[PDB]
């Protein structure tokens, strides 16, 4: 009704002027904002020997009061490429390791799992031994050494192995035939693989494991979960921050 | 494949003035247009294009009055390192560097009344044994003659003489490259009135600004005060 | 003469505020005249009067402060017209600035006062527009000056960007009266945003 | 979005990521 | 009067020829003087655990008798980038540190603050707990380790995050709707951000940051402080230096 | 559809306090919505501010934290058929962002509140 | 439907003042929004609510209001709407007209009131520019008036032209609840004259 | 001023500095 | 198969690899 200002007429509205660019959305890009290492995970390394379990990269159904866990849960189908940092913090005295070799094996979806050491090096009497799937081949073995290590750390790219053309990162329904409270919002494969970290540090020290998303798409937007609790009727909430009255 | 690569040995230093950029973390941010007036490019620009008043005793002016003659009303050593260039902006300025070349201008303007008058003479003095001390000395030199009451301001230029390119910023115990001479300001005549009772004494203010062809090159961090 | 302060004014609004903006014609900001002090014998030099425009004036700007008064926001320039009035026989300068963003103040904030400049400052207070008030030459300074300030617009509550510094550089000497210090100052290219609620 | 030095390409664009169909 | 030269006339000058321009101005270009490492600043690490407070980067209303503080005053309004370098130099023993991993964080203008350990690494036993705040993700967290290290330092280049388009280094009014005496030369967001820096060294060492300002403007030129005091009347400061008569 | 009434919606600038009734308000930029006339009405609080950019996480009222007010009256109460029917009716309130909206610095989560 | 009341608003400046004019621009003379009252089914045909404009509610005028208060003379016209609450069980109408210089008013001048009409007005007040609100048809009344008065301007503080007048012609009836009347007044095309001293 | 390197752009102008509007 | 940097042939074609006849 009427439209544009300064009659006061029932339905008529004041003229806004809208303002020019500046930034340009970029900022607000998804691929933009996936594109970097963000710290999901932290984990602990298996002992060389024995029956160890992979790890199963899974960044999607995250509770994490973090960026990437409410990001990751934006949209309903999720397809990128990955990215990974792997870096090793002592949790006891650094001069425990001498030597401190770490072998990280990379599963592609559905690579089989089972594992137990089988690869013997010998040298002067003492041998050691190391997994049946740490062994360099098929899929990426990376080995990096922690003992004089400037950065104690590893990383690679790696691709969207799945087999799904999309990840459900919401899915209305089972994975299996044999409809199990488990395999509710499932989905077999929904993922980007598996990691094995194997050492005879494992007591020693944990890992840290960063995922970057290059390549993101992000398909049907969903509601953003809140982050903050509700402030009173009527009022701010207020944080602390950079600007803040001093 | 692997590039074969060999690790000089100034290899892990940090160098604070490499011509080189560090690694960006936060891209892509488009800053908003910055309009604003006033913008400076360069400090010489602004040492050029202002003046800034001497400090002769801690006042921004030298006095005339009804008794003067002979004796020098106003003298400075030519170095940047002079006393009555002290608050000045191109003093100022000079302490981030350590050479200059070039000449400077002073401009004296005669404050005292329409109904005062007084005439100075003005003298550059080159590096000699020991300065003026009358007039009648000095005169032998470069000098203009200002007749307030002709033009009530007077612009003089303090010449570059020297055998170097540049000379220093910061002097001490006198030298080849230190100072440049001086520049005196003297009574032609007492200041006249129309009414001593009245008018006794004028100031004249003199400011400076760097010269057409002044520059500053070497720029330096700063030592302890003093 | 007259001198433009950093550059000429401009009509063009705010482009930061997306809601209407009133242009005030000359007739609605007109014009103001103030008498900023007198200039006294006692005084020496580096002493200054400090005027921050408007701010502790504003409510003696009759029209323009009515419509300020009601809106939140405002982009404007000054004409402003330093004056004296000395005879003759008197001697002595004064050194009338246009400085964006001064401070010392210490907090008298937005307040017409006197203070004594530092030395270092009353020196070089000439690396700001300005003009030099000699008083056996001239008896006027002209200094018009545009917007300034860190964002498009602002507060005239809580900002003055433009604030003249009338300085002592040559001490007042000659007949024993003093000089009075005289002040024109005009609202120019004003531009108002965002009104108030109603005073009740 | 993401990837800008000029050696982002050191590795062929069928190495470094995936190729869509 | 007259001009130019030797008749001595009233107002008449003598000539002058111009010396021709050699150094061309280069060194006085604002930008090129102030795209060069300051030590400006020398910080003290906190400790991974607790709730620390980030360290503002603002470097302008400085009394600091080094050659960045004034020249950072000359002008009345600044715009330029960033780029830092961190140091890091043992006050003890260096043997007292083993690993010494120091975690930075850097902060955009107006980002939130507060922060307490939460994030967990586990390793054998005894685990790590770092900042909720130092974690790598939406902002860059950058991750070096003292020991062994060449150069205990790291570095990178950061832009101007402010929301004003120019930094005001006066300001002639109050940051604040409540005008208090703390507000006053102020206005929020006038700086480069905020850091924060991290590590279980904390005690046995300090920083020592220096600010680059790459791309720099400088508007509205201001008086520039002395620097030195004044001498006696009709004499010259004399300071040691290069050249001096020996 | 058997009700009415009729809503004024204001913008209110930063200010010392808020107003507390609508002759008050209605000095400002407001709008005057007659139900009755459309069910639906959309109303756009602006931008005006000296800074190109504000913050997202306000704190103590500083000059880039707030912009004012949004309030809506009722200039005149509900009217119904019969009032035993319907005695009350409710104005639902939608956010969307505007034309010239932009968000700029990705930051990360900091310790809930 | 909007009826102008005589003619269309114009923007010429008023011929007996040689003095400098001010056109208001529409963001300056905004717009204003007043509940006038509640009609109820006590009241007879013939009442009717008085609203001369505007001299009673000036001071809510907000911007105009401060640009009006600060000047001797103005030239203006109004555009308002008057809007009734009522739902489609209730009967009546009420007669709005725009009278030039009315009166009765026992002078409680230029005060909105409620006064009883004497029979040949309530009857022929249709003869002045007017609309009916029948309630079983519609809700809104729209008039839009041109300056109007003896002389080219006038002083509002003595004089107020324009006055609506809200009639009732057939009571209310129907559900129990009143029905609220309610007005827009928007100035049109206001012209200020001669600034009046500052407040001290 | 003070960038005389050949690799001063190794990362683009865009992720190097800032970018004027 | 499997060599996909730019830097491949950092090494000529016969220092490398061997040479089918």
Redesign the interface.
């Known amino acids: 009704v009427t439209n544009v200002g300064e009659d006061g007429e029932p339905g008529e509205t004041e003229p806004r002027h809208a303002l020019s660019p500046v930034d340009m959305h970029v900022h607000t890009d998804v691929s933009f904002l996936l594109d970097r290492f963000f710290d999901v995970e932290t984990l602990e390394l298996s002992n060389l020997t024995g029956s160890p379990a992979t790890h199963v990269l899974d960044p999607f159904g995250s509770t994490a009061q973090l960026a990437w866990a409410r990001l990751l849960n934006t949209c309903t189908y999720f397809f990128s490429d990955l990215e990974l940092s792997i870096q090793f913090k002592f949790t006891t005295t650094p001069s425990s390791v001498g030597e401190g070799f770490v072998w990280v094996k990379w599963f592609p979806v559905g690579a089989p799992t089972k594992t137990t050491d089988a690869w013997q090096l010998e040298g002067g009497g003492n041998s050691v031994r190391i997994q049946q799937l740490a062994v360099a081949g098929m899929s990426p073995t990376v080995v990096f050494k922690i003992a004089g290590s400037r950065s104690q750390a590893c990383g690679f790219s790696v691709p969207y192995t799945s087999m799904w053309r999309v990840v459900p990162v919401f899915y209305n329904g089972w994975g299996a035939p044999t409809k199990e409270k488990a395999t509710y919002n499932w989905l077999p494969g929904a993922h980007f693989g598996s990691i094995l970290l194997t050492s005879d540090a494992h007591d020693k020290g944990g890992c840290y494991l960063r995922y970057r998303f290059p390549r993101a798409n992000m398909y049907c937007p969903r509601p953003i979960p809140p982050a903050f609790t509700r402030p009173a009727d009527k009022t701010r909430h207020k944080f602390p921050t950079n600007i803040n009255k001093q | 494949a692997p590039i074969r690569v060999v690790s000089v040995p100034e290899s892990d230093s940090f160098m604070s003035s490499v011509p080189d950029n560090s690694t960006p973390l936060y891209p892509k941010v488009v800053v908003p247009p910055r309009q604003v007036p006033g913008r400076f490019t360069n400090f010489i620009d602004v040492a050029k294009q202002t003046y800034s008043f001497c400090s002769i005793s801690g006042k921004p002016y030298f006095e005339v009055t009804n008794t003067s003659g002979d004796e020098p009303l106003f003298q400075m050593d030519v170095s940047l390192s002079a006393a009555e260039l002290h608050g000045t902006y191109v003093a100022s300025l000079s302490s981030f560097f350590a050479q200059y070349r070039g000449s400077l201008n002073f401009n004296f303007i005669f404050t005292g009344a329409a109904a005062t008058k007084a005439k100075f003479l003005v003298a550059f003095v080159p590096p000699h044994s020991a300065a003026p001390k009358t007039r009648d000395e000095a005169m032998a030199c470069i000098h203009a003659v200002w007749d307030v009451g002709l033009n009530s301001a007077f612009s003089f230029n303090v010449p570059y003489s020297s055998p170097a390119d540049f000379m220093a910023v910061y002097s001490a115990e006198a030298t080849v490259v230190n100072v440049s001479g001086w520049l005196q300001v003297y009574a032609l005549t007492a200041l006249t009135s129309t009414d001593i009772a009245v008018n006794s004494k004028g100031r004249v203010l003199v400011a400076v600004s760097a010269g057409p062809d002044f520059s500053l090159r070497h720029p330096v961090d700063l030592p302890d005060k003093q | 003469g007259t001198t433009y302060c950093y550059s000429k004014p401009d009509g063009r609004p705010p482009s930061t505020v997306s809601d209407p903006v009133t242009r005030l014609g000359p007739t609605l900001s007109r014009h103001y005249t103030f008498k900023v002090g007198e200039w006294p014998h006692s005084q020496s030099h580096g002493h200054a009067w400090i005027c921050p425009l408007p701010s502790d004036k504003l409510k003696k700007m009759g029209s323009f402060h009515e419509v300020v008064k009601a809106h939140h926001l405002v982009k404007n320039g000054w004409d402003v017209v330093v004056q004296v009035n000395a005879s003759f026989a008197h001697s002595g300068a004064l050194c009338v600035a246009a400085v964006p963003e001064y401070e010392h103040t210490h907090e008298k904030a937005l307040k017409w006062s006197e203070l004594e400049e530092p030395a270092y400052t009353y020196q070089q207070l000439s690396v700001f527009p300005h003009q030099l008030l000699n008083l056996r030459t001239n008896s006027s300074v002209h200094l018009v000056m545009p917007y300034i300030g860190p964002g498009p617009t602002t507060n005239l509550t809580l900002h003055n960007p433009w604030t003249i510094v009338i300085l002592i550089l040559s001490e007042l000497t000659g007949p024993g009266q003093t000089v009075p210090v005289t002040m024109s100052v005009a609202p120019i290219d004003a531009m108002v945003n965002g009104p108030l609620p109603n005073p009740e | 979005?993401?990837?800008?030095?000029?050696?982002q390409?050191?590795?062929?664009q069928?190495?470094?990521?995936?190729i869509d169909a």
Chains 1, 5 share one sequence.
């Open positions: 979005g993401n990837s800008g030095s000029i050696v390409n050191f590795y062929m069928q190495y470094q990521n995936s």
